Amino acid sequence: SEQLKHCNGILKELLSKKHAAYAWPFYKPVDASALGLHDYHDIIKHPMDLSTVKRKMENRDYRDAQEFAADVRLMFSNCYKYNPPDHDVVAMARKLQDVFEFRYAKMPD
Numbered sequence: 180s181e182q183l184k185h186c187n188g189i190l191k192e193l194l195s196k197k198h199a200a201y202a203w204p205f206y207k208p209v210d211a212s213a214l215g216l217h218d219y220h221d222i223i224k225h226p227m228d229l230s231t232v233k234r235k236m237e238n239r240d241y242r243d244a245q246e247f248a249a250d251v252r253l254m255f256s257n258c259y260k261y262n263p264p265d266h267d268v269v270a271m272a273r274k275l276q277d278v279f280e281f282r283y284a285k286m287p288d
């Protein structure tokens with residue numbers, strides 16, 4: 180769980196105010212009704228968000244670092260899948276993923 184402690188640190192950073200400018204769309208599940216998005220749940224079969232990830236870390240539902248990484252990347256992929264390349268939210272996901280991947284890359288073994 181030493182690797183997972185470092186994952187928990189990474190999660191904290193993603194959720195900190197420092198990255199709030201581009202992280203906010205990912206705090207919570209996409210609410211398709213509230214946003215008026217009729218086709219979202221058809222196009223995206225495995226929704227993911229930072230709250231779910233946080234919950235799974237807290238309940239210790241991750242077996243390892245790479246399970247955590249798959250969830251974080253799923254979240255970014257859903258966003259890239261669903262939205263157009265020029266959409267602000269795509270620019271925002273890329274900024275956050277930059278933080279994620281760099282930190283994740285800097286984990287020990």
Ligand SMILES: CC(=O)N1c2ccc(-c3ccc(C(=O)O)cc3)cc2[C@H](Nc2ccc(Cl)cc2)C[C@@H]1C
Pocket residue numbers: 203204205208209210214216257258261262267268
């Ligand atoms: C993740 C993803 O791809 N999407 C997503 C998810 C959640 C929210 C969202 C979340 C919170 C609020 C709010 O609290 O007001 C509003 C919209 C918005 C979006 C995206 N919409 C959006 C994002 C950024 C900007 Cl600057 C303008 C529009 C679309 C997409 C479904």
